[PDB]
Amino acid sequence: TQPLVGKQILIVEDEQVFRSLLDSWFSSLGATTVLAADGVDALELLGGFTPDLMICDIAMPRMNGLKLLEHIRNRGDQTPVLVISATENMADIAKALRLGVEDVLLKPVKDLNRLREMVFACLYPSMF
């Protein structure tokens, strides 16, 4: 019952309650998690490690997730990214898809069984 053993997930999210929920879910599935409350902090961290997947919020205090994405994509980083956001802004969702994220999911998350499918697909893809 641990399909994600051996996979490392970076979670970037400013609301501590949701940070805890994602940690609990992905840890229970066997992944080792790294959590960053802040986009600037996540940017610096990515300089020294290579997560298998990053789960990323959009609205965050100091630097939002779209700017985070641009910085790491501009430097050649092709880490798979799943965005989980409350945004309804279609331009901001399009910006993330242009930056090569696998999908953008809307908060609150309700089909946890679906989230599971998509995260596994992100970690063990069949095509590019």
Add this chain to the structure above:
Amino acid sequence: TQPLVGKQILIVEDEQVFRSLLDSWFSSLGATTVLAADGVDALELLGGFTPDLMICDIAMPRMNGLKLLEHIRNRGDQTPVLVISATENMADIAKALRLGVEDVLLKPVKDLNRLREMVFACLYPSMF
């Protein structure tokens, strides 16, 4: 009511429930938190960033906190460290104090007001 604004705290702890509690406490005090479920993961992360304080567990699955400490101290890292552990092993507590940790606190944590004092003292010391 945010005495830790501007300070970054790394939390290394394998139990997700306690990981969440520390995140909630330190975030509410204004610190930005980075959480690692795993000691090997924390070691790699420290190669690319410089937290103001690390809060560290001892018993963790793959690599315990004492080995983590030795590795980063052996490489010249003098990040302040606070150990929060359930260990009753006096030799293991002594090992951490020999590796230069500021203190070793026993789980479960009950004087949250005291934890606050000691973390601030670690971040804003008066002497060496």
